[PDB]
Design a protein around this ligand. Structure first.
Ligand SMILES: O=C(c1cc(Cn2c(=O)[nH]c(=O)c3ccccc32)ccc1F)N1CCN(CC(F)(F)F)CC1
Length: 351
């Protein structure tokens, strides 16, 4: 084929995100049975129905028996086959089980998108499939130059916001990309001038990235159990790189991850300290801020293209009896995010 004119790092990025074997690896990591539920048999309506059953299990847990629950638990395993042999699978009887499976279903939702892009589409052996796959993202991706001003600010954000409690690894920034999802600038227009616009981190496993870049960051669907998400069904960000970077789920065995930087229109924050499984915001609020015990030093906030970058070292927030060690931000309308950058990270596991 014609061999592809995209920069090496952009090509390596497309290779990672569309990797089929990585998709399967993630599925077995969640205990799915690939013989009963292969990648190609994944569908939306099956994920949705599984989300529904998990909402049934949530109802029964909220109202308190291991016996009346057995039936609900079993229905979930009927819909999403797990790898337990001739079995008896573990009982889904608590809040932890609902959170754990809801996460699993979130990931399947993005993997189904990635796989559908790979199998929709046309087949032309004279084209570099790198080029073919890039185009399916409907996202302009450029390499940010190491000596630019935006590179220096991003590297400082990474450098300053690695929490001491996440010191089991550190991060090197391998490549910084600037990304522009088609139509997203247009979608964000209503919020483009809102107060409290912040540049924030969103980490996810590499196998979700094709979905995120084609569809943007999305909210978990109606069917999904609201209780599976600490502040309900929104899009979640951090101001500490290490808190987002933990959601990459990298390891010694695959230590390259991907992390986003999004412009997030927070406006008037509904500030909270403990779990609140809300489905709408109080009138007049635009976001939730989960209040951390530690925050980037407010006084070291800097500007990048008109947007606040909270890149200070962590200090005490002064907030007292909170569930959260670090800040968390949630928006509940997809149009309040505009994705700006994508970092490829190398994780040095010190353990
Ligand atoms: O932002 C999230 C989300 C993400 C997390 C976990 N999480 C996370 O995965 N990455 C983070 O950087 C993060 C930062 C602060 C707090 C939580 C974070 C927990 C609940 C959530 F609702 N979602 C849910 C999965 N969504 C995909 C879909 F299933 F709905 F499609 C993307 C939006």
């Amino acid at each position: 084929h014609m061999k592809s004119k995209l920069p090496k790092p952009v090509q390596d990025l497309i290779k990672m995100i569309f990797d089929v074997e990585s998709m399967k690896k993630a599925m077995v990591e969640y205990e799915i049975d690939l013989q009963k539920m292969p990648l190609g048999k994944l569908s939306k309506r099956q994920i949705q129905a599984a989300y529904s059953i998990l909402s049934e299990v949530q109802q029964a847990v909220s109202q308190g028996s291991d016996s009346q629950i057995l039936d609900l638990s079993n229905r979930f395993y009927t819909l999403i086959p797990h790898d337990f042999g001739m079995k008896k699978p573990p009982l889904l009887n608590n809040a932890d089980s609902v959170q754990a499976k809801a996460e699993m279903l979130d990931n399947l939702l993005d993997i189904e998108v990635a796989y559908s892009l790979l199998r929709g589409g046309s087949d032309d052996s004279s084209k570099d499939p790198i080029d073919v796959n890039y185009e399916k993202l409907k996202t302009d991706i450029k390499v940010v130059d190491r000596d630019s001003e935006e590179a220096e600010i991003i590297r400082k954000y990474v450098k300053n916001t690695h929490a001491t409690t996440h010191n089991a690894y550190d991060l090197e920034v391998i490549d910084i990309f600037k990304i522009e999802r088609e139509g997203e600038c247009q979608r964000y227009k209503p919020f483009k001038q809102l107060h409290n616009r912040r540049l924030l981190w969103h980490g996810s496993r590499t196998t979700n990235f094709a979905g995120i870049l084609s569809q943007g960051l999305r909210i978990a669907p109606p069917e999904a159990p609201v209780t599976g998400y600490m502040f309900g069904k929104g899009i979640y960000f951090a101001d500490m790189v290490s808190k987002s970077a933990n959601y990459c789920h990298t390891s010694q065995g695959d230590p390259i991850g991907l992390i986003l930087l999004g412009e997030v229109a927070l406006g008037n924050m509904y500030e909270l300290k403990h779990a609140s499984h809300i489905s709408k915001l109080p009138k007049g609020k635009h976001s939730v801020k989960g209040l951390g015990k530690t925050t980037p030093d407010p006084s070291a906030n800097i500007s990048l293209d008109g947007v606040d970058v909270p890149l200070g070292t962590g200090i005490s927030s002064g907030v007292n009896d909170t569930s959260l060690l670090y800040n968390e931000y949630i928006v509940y309308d997809i149009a309040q995010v505009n994705l700006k950058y994508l970092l490829k990270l190398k994780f040095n596991f010190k353990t």
